[PDB]
Amino acid sequence: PIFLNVLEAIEPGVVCAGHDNNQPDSFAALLSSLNELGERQLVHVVKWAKALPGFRNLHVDDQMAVIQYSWMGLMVFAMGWRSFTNANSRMLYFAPDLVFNEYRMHKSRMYSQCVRMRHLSQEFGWLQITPQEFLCMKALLLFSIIPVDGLKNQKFFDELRMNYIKELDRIIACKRSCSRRFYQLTKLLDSVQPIARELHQFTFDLLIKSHMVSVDFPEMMAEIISVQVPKILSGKVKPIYFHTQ
Ligand SMILES: C[C@]12CCC(=O)C[C@@H]1CC[C@@H]1[C@@H]2CC[C@]2(C)[C@@H](O)CC[C@@H]12
Ligand SMILES: [Li+]
């Protein structure tokens, strides 16, 4: 099982947010900390993606683009997973030093988004998702959002995505019905996209007004959110869904 060996080997470790838990919870502090966490995790997601089987088959411009479009969904999905394994989805485990209870969900003014994310975390429990399933699903999320007009070399992308789908199917097949399970997992993967879209909308709006509300955006975050995220929100870049929405 070369493929699973690899996904397991490359899986990023713990990333902390740098949040000061001594200071009262305020919108500005929580969101600055989440933004900082995003920047730190972005560094890990890039090194992760670059080490994925076949990823170097993509054109270099496409390597960068798939990361830039998919990071939100990937980070939300992994955060769901950590919340499940650490808090049993009772709280959102963004980082060891940044765990949201209901009060912080309220204070972050992202309560409805946090509800959807906690629901995804709950699905990990409800569907009894295995770590191997999680790892393959996560890899497939990197290949789940692309420009409507296609990438630089779409053929390389299509083939890579195909290979990852096949890998998910094998993992299900190697389990003690297959069809139900595949249906369940593709439905779960689809459910990440609407959550990612609401956070895309939220973060874009926040960047625009960030001076006003004293929320800090680090450099990579500000740039992707103003350059790449608007492509998604304007419909130039769209998620690939398994099932019809
Ligand atoms: C991806 C992050 C940070 C990484 C993580 O664990 C999930 C989480 C989901 C909400 C995001 C946050 C990064 C910063 C964002 C985008 C804020 O600007 C508003 C929503 C935040
Ligand atoms: Li705090």
Side-chain angles (χ1 to χ4, degrees):
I2 292 312
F3 180 72
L4 266 174
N5 283 344
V6 178
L7 289 202
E8 284 158 359
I10 60 167
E11 178 68 359
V14 167
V15 175
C16 295
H19 188 64
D20 179 354
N21 287 284
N22 295 111
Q23 301 307 293
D25 287 330
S26 76
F27 179 65
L30 294 174
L31 265 297
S32 301
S33 281
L34 279 177
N35 282 343
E36 173 66 25
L37 178 65
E39 183 94 344
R40 293 184 181 188
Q41 292 239 246
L42 189 49
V43 168
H44 287 88
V45 167
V46 169
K47 287 174 180 176
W48 170 82
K50 278 196 202 146
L52 275 168
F55 179 83
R56 284 182 159 15
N57 298 337
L58 302 176
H59 196 283
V60 72
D61 299 330
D62 290 336
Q63 295 184 24
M64 164 160 14
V66 300
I67 297 166
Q68 278 171 322
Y69 300 144
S70 76
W71 62 268
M72 178 80 70
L74 285 162
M75 301 187 184
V76 164
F77 193 72
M79 185 279 294
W81 177 255
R82 287 197 286 290
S83 295
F84 167 54
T85 68
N86 292 333
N88 193 47
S89 315
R90 264 179 15 115
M91 295 185 286
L92 294 181
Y93 195 101
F94 289 109
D97 61 336
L98 188 58
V99 182
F100 274 26
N101 43 33
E102 291 254 323
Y103 180 75
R104 287 169 157 185
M105 289 172 194
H106 182 79
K107 276 324 255 20
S108 71
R109 311 178 190 166
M110 313 197 333
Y111 188 102
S112 54
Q113 295 86 353
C114 288
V115 160
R116 297 189 78 182
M117 286 185 284
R118 179 182 55 202
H119 193 269
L120 176 66
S121 183
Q122 282 174 289
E123 292 277 21
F124 286 121
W126 292 329
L127 292 173
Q128 298 185 124
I129 297 304
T130 72
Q132 300 67 41
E133 281 169 335
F134 162 73
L135 288 181
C136 302
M137 284 191 279
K138 189 158 58 57
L140 191 47
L141 271 178
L142 180 59
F143 306 117
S144 292
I145 174 154
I146 65 153
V148 306
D149 285 340
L151 295 161
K152 196 127 207 181
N153 196 352
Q154 191 63 39
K155 266 190 206 176
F156 288 163
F157 176 90
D158 291 339
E159 171 82 19
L160 201 51
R161 172 180 166 80
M162 176 168 68
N163 290 331
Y164 279 79
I165 296 167
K166 274 179 154 98
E167 287 305 341
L168 179 58
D169 202 23
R170 272 196 209 90
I171 304 323
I172 297 165
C174 268
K175 131 198 235 207
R176 258 49 90 86
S177 72
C178 277
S179 330
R180 196 185 227 266
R181 186 50 166 191
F182 189 76
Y183 178 85
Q184 271 164 353
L185 295 195
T186 61
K187 270 302 203 210
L188 176 59
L189 279 165
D190 284 353
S191 75
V192 179
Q193 299 299 340
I195 301 173
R197 191 192 167 79
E198 286 179 349
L199 290 167
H200 280 143
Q201 179 66 246
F202 188 88
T203 198
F204 172 81
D205 293 343
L206 181 52
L207 180 58
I208 293 309
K209 71 188 163 127
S210 60
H211 180 90
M212 187 147 13
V213 287
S214 304
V215 169
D216 298 287
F217 280 83
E219 276 204 352
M220 278 256 267
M221 294 290 285
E223 193 229 291
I224 289 167
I225 299 172
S226 66
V227 176
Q228 314 291 348
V229 166
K231 291 180 200 158
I232 298 175
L233 300 173
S234 63
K236 274 183 174 168
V237 168
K238 279 194 171 135
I240 305 167
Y241 280 105
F242 279 100
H243 310 268
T244 328
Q245 309 304 107

PDB file of all heavy atoms in Angstrom, residues 124-135:
ATOM      1  N   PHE A 124     -17.820  13.246  11.182  1.00  0.00           N
ATOM      2  CA  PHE A 124     -16.717  12.297  11.279  1.00  0.00           C
ATOM      3  C   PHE A 124     -17.089  11.183  12.246  1.00  0.00           C
ATOM      4  O   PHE A 124     -16.792  10.026  11.977  1.00  0.00           O
ATOM      5  CB  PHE A 124     -15.407  12.952  11.700  1.00  0.00           C
ATOM      6  CG  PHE A 124     -14.786  13.758  10.584  1.00  0.00           C
ATOM      7  CD1 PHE A 124     -14.531  15.112  10.740  1.00  0.00           C
ATOM      8  CD2 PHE A 124     -14.398  13.135   9.403  1.00  0.00           C
ATOM      9  CE1 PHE A 124     -13.989  15.846   9.698  1.00  0.00           C
ATOM     10  CE2 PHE A 124     -13.789  13.865   8.387  1.00  0.00           C
ATOM     11  CZ  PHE A 124     -13.604  15.222   8.536  1.00  0.00           C
ATOM     12  N   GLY A 125     -17.742  11.565  13.353  1.00  0.00           N
ATOM     13  CA  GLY A 125     -18.250  10.620  14.338  1.00  0.00           C
ATOM     14  C   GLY A 125     -19.408   9.801  13.774  1.00  0.00           C
ATOM     15  O   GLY A 125     -19.363   8.575  13.787  1.00  0.00           O
ATOM     16  N   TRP A 126     -20.402  10.498  13.203  1.00  0.00           N
ATOM     17  CA  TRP A 126     -21.638   9.851  12.793  1.00  0.00           C
ATOM     18  C   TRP A 126     -21.365   8.795  11.729  1.00  0.00           C
ATOM     19  O   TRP A 126     -22.054   7.778  11.709  1.00  0.00           O
ATOM     20  CB  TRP A 126     -22.716  10.843  12.324  1.00  0.00           C
ATOM     21  CG  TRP A 126     -23.257  11.718  13.408  1.00  0.00           C
ATOM     22  CD1 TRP A 126     -23.399  11.425  14.736  1.00  0.00           C
ATOM     23  CD2 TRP A 126     -23.714  13.072  13.242  1.00  0.00           C
ATOM     24  NE1 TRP A 126     -23.917  12.503  15.403  1.00  0.00           N
ATOM     25  CE2 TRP A 126     -24.112  13.531  14.518  1.00  0.00           C
ATOM     26  CE3 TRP A 126     -23.801  13.942  12.143  1.00  0.00           C
ATOM     27  CZ2 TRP A 126     -24.623  14.815  14.713  1.00  0.00           C
ATOM     28  CZ3 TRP A 126     -24.305  15.213  12.342  1.00  0.00           C
ATOM     29  CH2 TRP A 126     -24.701  15.642  13.613  1.00  0.00           C
ATOM     30  N   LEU A 127     -20.383   9.036  10.845  1.00  0.00           N
ATOM     31  CA  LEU A 127     -20.084   8.116   9.746  1.00  0.00           C
ATOM     32  C   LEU A 127     -18.942   7.169  10.096  1.00  0.00           C
ATOM     33  O   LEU A 127     -18.579   6.314   9.292  1.00  0.00           O
ATOM     34  CB  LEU A 127     -19.715   8.921   8.490  1.00  0.00           C
ATOM     35  CG  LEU A 127     -20.833   9.737   7.838  1.00  0.00           C
ATOM     36  CD1 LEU A 127     -20.253  10.611   6.718  1.00  0.00           C
ATOM     37  CD2 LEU A 127     -21.925   8.818   7.278  1.00  0.00           C
ATOM     38  N   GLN A 128     -18.358   7.328  11.285  1.00  0.00           N
ATOM     39  CA  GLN A 128     -17.262   6.488  11.750  1.00  0.00           C
ATOM     40  C   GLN A 128     -16.144   6.510  10.705  1.00  0.00           C
ATOM     41  O   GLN A 128     -15.661   5.475  10.270  1.00  0.00           O
ATOM     42  CB  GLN A 128     -17.689   5.032  12.006  1.00  0.00           C
ATOM     43  CG  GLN A 128     -18.747   4.856  13.090  1.00  0.00           C
ATOM     44  CD  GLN A 128     -19.047   3.401  13.401  1.00  0.00           C
ATOM     45  OE1 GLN A 128     -18.935   2.955  14.544  1.00  0.00           O
ATOM     46  NE2 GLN A 128     -19.421   2.635  12.386  1.00  0.00           N
ATOM     47  N   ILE A 129     -15.734   7.714  10.307  1.00  0.00           N
ATOM     48  CA  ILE A 129     -14.684   7.870   9.307  1.00  0.00           C
ATOM     49  C   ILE A 129     -13.353   7.374   9.883  1.00  0.00           C
ATOM     50  O   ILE A 129     -12.955   7.826  10.950  1.00  0.00           O
ATOM     51  CB  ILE A 129     -14.591   9.355   8.895  1.00  0.00           C
ATOM     52  CG1 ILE A 129     -15.858   9.892   8.224  1.00  0.00           C
ATOM     53  CG2 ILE A 129     -13.339   9.617   8.062  1.00  0.00           C
ATOM     54  CD1 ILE A 129     -16.280   9.113   7.008  1.00  0.00           C
ATOM     55  N   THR A 130     -12.633   6.513   9.148  1.00  0.00           N
ATOM     56  CA  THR A 130     -11.329   6.047   9.606  1.00  0.00           C
ATOM     57  C   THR A 130     -10.244   7.069   9.256  1.00  0.00           C
ATOM     58  O   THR A 130     -10.420   7.872   8.330  1.00  0.00           O
ATOM     59  CB  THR A 130     -10.916   4.681   9.045  1.00  0.00           C
ATOM     60  OG1 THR A 130     -10.598   4.896   7.672  1.00  0.00           O
ATOM     61  CG2 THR A 130     -11.961   3.590   9.192  1.00  0.00           C
ATOM     62  N   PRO A 131      -9.104   7.095   9.991  1.00  0.00           N
ATOM     63  CA  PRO A 131      -7.971   7.958   9.627  1.00  0.00           C
ATOM     64  C   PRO A 131      -7.522   7.849   8.172  1.00  0.00           C
ATOM     65  O   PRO A 131      -7.165   8.860   7.563  1.00  0.00           O
ATOM     66  CB  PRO A 131      -6.853   7.472  10.566  1.00  0.00           C
ATOM     67  CG  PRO A 131      -7.614   7.038  11.798  1.00  0.00           C
ATOM     68  CD  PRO A 131      -8.844   6.344  11.246  1.00  0.00           C
ATOM     69  N   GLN A 132      -7.526   6.628   7.623  1.00  0.00           N
ATOM     70  CA  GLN A 132      -7.121   6.404   6.246  1.00  0.00           C
ATOM     71  C   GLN A 132      -8.143   7.051   5.312  1.00  0.00           C
ATOM     72  O   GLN A 132      -7.773   7.591   4.271  1.00  0.00           O
ATOM     73  CB  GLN A 132      -6.924   4.910   5.983  1.00  0.00           C
ATOM     74  CG  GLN A 132      -5.848   4.291   6.887  1.00  0.00           C
ATOM     75  CD  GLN A 132      -6.173   4.238   8.369  1.00  0.00           C
ATOM     76  OE1 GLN A 132      -7.294   3.943   8.784  1.00  0.00           O
ATOM     77  NE2 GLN A 132      -5.177   4.509   9.199  1.00  0.00           N
ATOM     78  N   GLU A 133      -9.428   6.943   5.672  1.00  0.00           N
ATOM     79  CA  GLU A 133     -10.462   7.547   4.852  1.00  0.00           C
ATOM     80  C   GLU A 133     -10.258   9.059   4.881  1.00  0.00           C
ATOM     81  O   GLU A 133     -10.330   9.722   3.837  1.00  0.00           O
ATOM     82  CB  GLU A 133     -11.862   7.167   5.325  1.00  0.00           C
ATOM     83  CG  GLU A 133     -12.271   5.767   4.880  1.00  0.00           C
ATOM     84  CD  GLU A 133     -13.539   5.277   5.560  1.00  0.00           C
ATOM     85  OE1 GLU A 133     -13.858   5.764   6.686  1.00  0.00           O
ATOM     86  OE2 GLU A 133     -14.259   4.486   4.919  1.00  0.00           O
ATOM     87  N   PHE A 134     -10.036   9.581   6.089  1.00  0.00           N
ATOM     88  CA  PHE A 134      -9.820  11.008   6.253  1.00  0.00           C
ATOM     89  C   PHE A 134      -8.683  11.479   5.346  1.00  0.00           C
ATOM     90  O   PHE A 134      -8.845  12.473   4.633  1.00  0.00           O
ATOM     91  CB  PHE A 134      -9.570  11.354   7.715  1.00  0.00           C
ATOM     92  CG  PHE A 134      -8.928  12.702   7.880  1.00  0.00           C
ATOM     93  CD1 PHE A 134      -9.641  13.867   7.669  1.00  0.00           C
ATOM     94  CD2 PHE A 134      -7.594  12.776   8.261  1.00  0.00           C
ATOM     95  CE1 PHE A 134      -9.009  15.100   7.813  1.00  0.00           C
ATOM     96  CE2 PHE A 134      -6.969  13.999   8.423  1.00  0.00           C
ATOM     97  CZ  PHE A 134      -7.691  15.156   8.219  1.00  0.00           C
ATOM     98  N   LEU A 135      -7.549  10.752   5.378  1.00  0.00           N
ATOM     99  CA  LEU A 135      -6.362  11.156   4.640  1.00  0.00           C
ATOM    100  C   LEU A 135      -6.629  11.188   3.132  1.00  0.00           C
ATOM    101  O   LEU A 135      -6.191  12.100   2.439  1.00  0.00           O
ATOM    102  CB  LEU A 135      -5.202  10.218   4.983  1.00  0.00           C
ATOM    103  CG  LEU A 135      -4.614  10.376   6.387  1.00  0.00           C
ATOM    104  CD1 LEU A 135      -3.467   9.396   6.544  1.00  0.00           C
ATOM    105  CD2 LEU A 135      -4.118  11.798   6.605  1.00  0.00           C
TER     106      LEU A 135
END
